[PDB]
């Protein structure tokens, strides 16, 4: 519970002298508060680690997941974006940035640009097919032609079966 | 490209150096493919050594 | 303690015995440090080998490795840093002591250093080719 995390973090910050050494435990402190659903105490302990380890891509990713669990779309995306800047191997996180942008704004040139970046890391992916579908049905008559070329060119890789041929 | 839809993983706060790397080699196709190049290049040097290890007079 | 009370289930006999030993594995350093810290204050400037041994008899392996890097004994610092678990190094030193005794190369090494190698090898007493015992 909260009070067990608080009792552990009190004795573990007692067994720490200097402020920077308390901040260096902040990542651990933050995940224990998240495991109690204390999301602001998690945010507050990960930010007090990040302000002492500015370049940790998992601390930025953990702050992004805490903003996703506070419905704060572009702050989840910014902390994920910053985690991709600090470790570009995260193809999954390039896709998760497209996933949270197309769920915020369909007109956003950043949503379409991060889908571009996800497709160029994961071709032949139904999760990227439907992130194009959700832009192109919203691009109107200019959308229709791009959606036709998409449907034919990605069916030609492997269908879902049934659905896209009925659509 | 057949597993990527599924791997909604969570890290343990009590994880070891070993279990952070057991997670990394699932999480990271760049590290995974880079080690497959290490294993490949080490296998070339292995096959040029063959039977010979016990023929060494000091 | 402050390690079983954290567990929201009835804690198993082994987990109790483990933390009784982990607590006593703090006690046996706390009952020793002020004598080690005087012993090191005296020995450090005359023999760093006895100072490294005094840290090790209080489990201060980090300070022992630090003093071995400060004295110019860097393969002793490497040997000591690896000793925090592996039985392989305990058995490799068990062999190396059996080599040096039979080949009479033991009498070409410091008895104070052979005392560290015997401690690390898990040997309470070692019998040398000289018929000395450490």
Swiss-Prot record, chain A:
Subcellular location as annotated: Nucleus; Nucleus membrane; Nucleus, Nuclear pore complex; Nucleus envelope
The protein's role, per its UniProt record: E3 SUMO-protein ligase which facilitates SUMO1 and SUMO2 conjugation by UBE2I. Involved in transport factor (Ran-GTP, karyopherin)-mediated protein import via the F-G repeat-containing domain which acts as a docking site for substrates. Binds single-stranded RNA (in vitro). May bind DNA. Component of the nuclear export pathway. Specific docking site for the nuclear export factor exportin-1. Inhibits EIF4E-dependent mRNA export. Sumoylates PML at 'Lys-490' which is essential for the proper assembly of PML-NB.
List of residues that carry Phosphothreonine: 16
List of residues that carry Phosphoserine: 18
Gene: RANBP2
Similarity field: Belongs to the RanBP2 E3 ligase family.
Residues of the full protein shown: 4 to 170 of 3224
Domain notes: Contains FG repeats. FG repeats are interaction sites for karyopherins (importins, exportins) and form probably an affinity gradient, guiding the transport proteins unidirectionally with their cargo through the NPC. FG repeat regions are highly flexible and lack ordered secondary structure. The overall conservation of FG repeats regarding exact sequence, spacing, and repeat unit length is limited.
Post-translational modification as stated in the protein's UniProt record: Polyubiquitinated by PRKN, which leads to proteasomal degradation.
Subunit relationships: Part of the nuclear pore complex. Forms a complex with NXT1, NXF1 and RANGAP1. Forms a tight complex with RANBP1 and UBE2I. Interacts with SUMO1 but not SUMO2. Interacts with PRKN. Interacts with sumoylated RANGAP1. Interacts with CDCA8. Interacts with PML (isoform PML-4). Interacts with BICD2. Interacts with MCM3AP isoform GANP. Interacts with COX11. Interacts with synaptic plasticity regulator PANTS.
TPR repeats: 23-56, 57-90, 91-125
The organism's place on the tree of life at top rank: Eukaryota
Stated name of the protein: E3 SUMO-protein ligase RanBP2
Swiss-Prot record, chain B:
Species of provenance: Homo sapiens (Human)
Name of the molecule in the record: Nuclear pore complex protein Nup107
Shown part of the complete sequence: 233 to 290 of 925
Record note on quaternary structure: Part of the nuclear pore complex (NPC). Forms part of the Nup160 subcomplex in the nuclear pore which is composed of NUP160, NUP133, NUP107 and Nup96; this complex plays a role in RNA export and in tethering Nup98 and NUP153 to the nucleus. Does not interact with TPR. Interacts with ZNF106.
Family: Belongs to the nucleoporin Nup84/Nup107 family.
Name of the encoding gene: NUP107
Known function: Plays a role in the nuclear pore complex (NPC) assembly and/or maintenance. Required for the assembly of peripheral proteins into the NPC. May anchor NUP62 to the NPC. Involved in nephrogenesis.
Lineage: Eukaryota, Metazoa, Chordata, Craniata, Vertebrata
Compartments (UniProt record): Nucleus membrane; Nucleus, Nuclear pore complex; Chromosome, Centromere, Kinetochore
Disease entry from the Swiss-Prot or TrEMBL record: Nephrotic syndrome 11: A form of nephrotic syndrome, a renal disease clinically characterized by severe proteinuria, resulting in complications such as hypoalbuminemia, hyperlipidemia and edema. Kidney biopsies show non-specific histologic changes such as focal segmental glomerulosclerosis and diffuse mesangial proliferation. Some affected individuals have an inherited steroid-resistant form and progress to end-stage renal failure. NPHS11 is an autosomal recessive, steroid-resistant and progressive form with onset in the first decade of life. Ovarian dysgenesis 6: A form of ovarian dysgenesis, a disorder characterized by lack of spontaneous pubertal development, primary amenorrhea, uterine hypoplasia, and hypergonadotropic hypogonadism as a result of streak gonads. ODG6 is an autosomal recessive condition.
Tissue/organ expression: Ubiquitously expressed in fetal and adult tissues.
From Swiss-Prot, chain C:
Organism: Homo sapiens (Human)
Protein name: Nuclear pore complex protein Nup96
Residues with the Phosphoserine modification: 47
Recorded superkingdom: Eukaryota
Residues of the full protein shown: 1283 to 1416 of 1817
